[PDB]
Symmetry: D3
Subunit: 269 residues, 6 copies
């Protein structure tokens, strides 16, 4: 059972060899197993993965359709056993008012997760609704604290950050990896130029605290291996990419559909 | 909500147009959704689908790892809402000692299922163990009785049959579609042609209008299914679960993962 | 015989004609509901945010991934329905729930003994790009409108929150009996509220002239404020309170009583 | 998090200042939070609290309507996170034949409860029915044993006692506080004074420094508690539950509802 | 599937033939199955049966160790499928404050129960505690109302009665069978039972001449005791047994079998 | 609370004194309590116990009517608190794809079980169905691994074996007791002669790994004490008997039926 330090050494080794760190979301055990088979560097499981693999939108994991934290424990039964040599992280809902994080994080460690991520995250929420949440005890600060406690438990931490300010707070928390989240994936949101600017801004910020933080990109217009490649070319300090919808949903969806059509096409002589 | 008779017309019209009826298993909402996008004729959900998509073996669905009938109800929540114009059937564990068929089949229909299939089925089990089950109250006969009650409740019924005897028993229960299960993936392709034909001849002694699908054994792919259509004139299609959702999903996620892992800075 | 939807509407219209305001209440516990009925409230609505406010958490906890809202409302029915003897109790339904079959769940709620439904939790409370993304990916207010339309076909009393003239039209066309004009988290100025409520009233009226209109939210915090809205918004017939009805009164009373017991002293 | 001894010292310091110890029952997180907002000295949660805040009777917590010990674990997530500087105790059903008492108490400590009380308690049950319970393994002695075990785990213990004999057993068990229980909030005030004084005298035969609170029967309000303080020299406070949260919340929600129903718009 | 009317006919026919009606409590599927094998006339299932078959005391079913009404529903799947031609009744907790009686009785009928009995019953509770329960909405009168509503749904009803007053109340409710409950088995003297049962028969006859009357409880522990009562109480038509029917036989048989296996020795 | 070593020493002391070890299945708390009342040597609880006590067939515990591993945890509450001085073992479904053995076995130990047994077991399954299960991640060898791990946690292990090969595997895993399982209890199954041969072969196979391993008989036509005694007579290294259907189901069934008849037989006097 590798330590956090060993995992961070594993990654920084690949980074020095010019190899990207790719993390993936798994919503089913088959997803997890297939991602391991493609030599994925780390796998994360959250409620959104389930909902995604149910054919629903990713943002379904942020709303009142189920308890995120209880769903992730339930999903562990499906996923952990079929993954044999790849670290699996738990998406933790850090603002859960009915969870004691310290206890829950220990529980996740004993279940077998290598680490955690803050997901669902209020960082995806904007507007006056976001402001009210921050004002009434459902703030990103609480996610930051959750990451800090996880770090103190020697769990790997790969938190989503949406700004330099977030990048700092999570650096100071002891985050091993920062996933710069650009927004929901797939001309609605951020330009590719905006992503470049923000990601570089977060890199410079992160580094004010610590020069050896690993920084990966996720979301908005970064939708496919070529988009991920453009970020690696554009942002020097960025060394990889986290994908969930890109990794498991769209591929499966295409393949199942193509296969169905193929059977449907056969005719008798 | 289309009636059973409407669904049977739809299928019999496609058969007369020379089109195969293809049925599919969905272990996830995404599976069902993508099978509908591929214009599948019907979708069936059951525990084994869920376990396949968890990356376990199909037969995990037959063992003491969960209650099949409770799982299919839970899966209804994930699948039924994302399927818009395709009938969805419930795999029902007919030997369940703690179920009341009547009340349960009535529940599945209220929930929105278009029909039922006998799965998990003791018909996959063989040997002394199968004989012990048959003798101690867990018989395929009970799965036949379940399909009969389903029929009396005007549910579409697409049961698995394993022999001419099964095919007859199920034909009499009022089965709309007989899926000839060639069993454990083994039978040679030729053995399958001969047994499927025997079941068709058996079915046809009860009534001439029953729809017959193939599944299982070496029938792994579209050209295998085609081969059975060519060899068994009374056979009108194919049902696939593992072939439809598992191997395609598996291979696509792996390849996608590798494409992400293979990117390099310029 | 429990009253029919028509009979409740008749009951409310009769009070409106007498110049009595219609007061709707949120109940998060059975004691809340019972106490509201004791104060002659006209209707009671129960949902997760009620439970959570009575657990001392923020209202908006009911909108996030801390539980399944639609399961919780069903769980709450045994706490409330039995202690409410002659007042309609409605269920907040989460209309965008992807794992709900709408028609069967509404039918369930009717069989359980609910008189009606409201759309809560609601995406109407959500703004910005996040709302736009939700709207674009299957979690639209339009789904809540459809939920209400189906509830209406089942002859459930419907009392949806609306946040705009657009919402008011959509819900009015769905067959809403009562529109609750929600001004945001209990923000908008009082003048802003007068304007928007009047706009919602106008919007509802382009569809049907007999819809019952209640205010809620934003700065409308107390009887005086509700009355101001009544004076200012002639087509408004009342008020829906949740936080103002159960949380604040309970909080202040329990604090006071604790202090009262602590202040006791032996004679000496 | 303060230790058992740190809490007892705190109480004795108050007592030396001539200030009574007020204990409160809480059935919801809002109740707990409001009790802490009034600087209550300790909070105790259990099923009867939940049930009273659901509008039902206190004695509902004693019968086959739920599993007490599971309920109190469930209530922990509602109450513990919103209480910041007040000890919270768990009512434990000490005769529960499916609980392993030592494991359960351990779990409660780990969860973050400061201590325990024997509730539900068979001490409220009398007559032949009680005799049968005592003879068939549902005895008050098992509740005494549970408090003994709780005390060995350094949990604060605040048991109900119904007689001087109960007072000695719990004193001998290591109880920190004895709550003299006079019945459902029956006995006259004078009867209560004699019984409490009998319990104080019996407890004192074991330890001089045990804290004694009154609860129940005709002790309904602060004036009543005061009377007991005046009448019972060795008594140093009061535990309230029904009087602390149900009656206050009830009356407050009713009045607020009436205030809203009383509003009248200006003439048209 | 037999109607209530048909079962009562079936029973009266046996009575006219001089056969006693024997009812049994079943706490497991095997119990029910074995009781049918022995030509039991009816089977009633409830929490205490489960709990006795778990090795606990009968009175565990009355206290806060679980929800009785939820348990009877969970037991249905264990029992109903293995009973092929005997009526199975549900013990309903009639004072359950979280139960909606009309919908719950309807649920039970759908599931396939032939009838109901009031169990757990507050009739086993005495003293001031029972007076308190009676005064705060957990009264035998509610159990009477539950049986009345069950009779309206054409469920067979076999209530426990503890007095001539109970016998009249339940007779007027439409009870098909009154079970005269003498208290906890293995209390009342045998003579006290004869008198009370004769009083209940007399009281029931004031309402109707064709009610079926069974004995249960107290010293009525075995076939001989049951026969004594038949001989001593003319209007008594049989016996209901729960602890005597399943628990004691199973206990003794299992212990004997264990010793029989242990007794074996290798032979040279 | 006794250590595994103390339990083994206790059993071995009986054996040395010429007395058989008797193990029993309990599906209810009353059963467990009644078996302890007869000074049974050990008790094992699992879904098939519960299901037999619900009037269903033993093999119902193998099929998709429930999660065996969840059920045995649920049963603990019913049984552990009423057994005061007898080891109680948990049946563990070793091929459960959604269980992590290590953490589950720690839980069971912590919950208060003295040990474990492989039940439900694929050993009861034959034919091509069995072969398929073995080939697709549901093999008896996973049951062996579970026992190996339980042993490493110092849990008492009392697995079922169905062959000499099974006996060797379990012996190497550190099994304290092997239960030679002859098939479903009670013309259909193995003859007594077949049972004698198979048990004697397992005994010798096991003893080549560990001379002092404890061996009990179960199943097939070994239905009553005389049958169990016959096996003692015929299988010299067999030290006792594990009964489940025979220990609780049959005795209770018959006693409840006889009691019911006894009440139905009463009549008023002439
Ligand atoms: Cl409000
Ligand atoms: Cl609200
Ligand atoms: Cl009080
Ligand atoms: Cl009895
Ligand atoms: Cl069997
Ligand atoms: Cl046996």
């Amino acid at each position: 059972r590798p330590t956090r330090s060993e995992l961070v050494d594993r990654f920084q080794k690949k980074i020095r060899a010019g190899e990207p760190i790719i993390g993936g979301g798994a919503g089913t055990g088959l997803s997890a197993k297939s991602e391991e088979a493609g030599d994925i560097d780390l796998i994360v499981i959250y409620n959104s993965g389930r909902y995604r693999m149910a054919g629903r939108g990713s943002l379904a994991g942020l709303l009142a359709y189920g308890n995120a934290n209880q769903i992730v424990v339930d999903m562990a039964r499906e996923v952990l056993p079929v993954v044999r040599h790849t670290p699996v992280l738990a998406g933790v809902n850090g603002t859960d008012p009915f969870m004691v994080m310290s206890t829950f994080l220990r529980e996740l460690k004993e279940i077998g997760f290598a680490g955690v991520q803050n997901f669902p995250t209020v960082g995806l929420i904007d507007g006056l609704f976001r402001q009210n949440l921050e004002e009434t005890g459902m703030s990103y600060a609480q996610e930051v604290e959750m990451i800090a406690e996880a770090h103190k438990l020697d769990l790997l931490t790969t938190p989503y950050v949406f700004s330099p300010e977030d990048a700092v707070a999570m650096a100071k928390a002891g985050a091993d990896i920062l996933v710069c989240h650009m927004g929901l994936t797939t001309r609605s949101g951020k330009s590719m130029d905006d992503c470049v600017s923000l990601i570089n801004e977060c890199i410079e910020a992160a580094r004010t605290i610590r020069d050896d933080i690993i920084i990966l990109s996720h979301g908005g217009p970064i939708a496919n291996p070529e988009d991920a490649r453009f970020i690696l070319d554009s942002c020097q300090g960025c060394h990889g990419f986290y994908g969930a919808s890109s990794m498991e949903r769209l591929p499966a969806e295409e393949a199942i559909r193509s296969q169905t059509l193929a059977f449907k096409a056969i005719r008798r002589q």
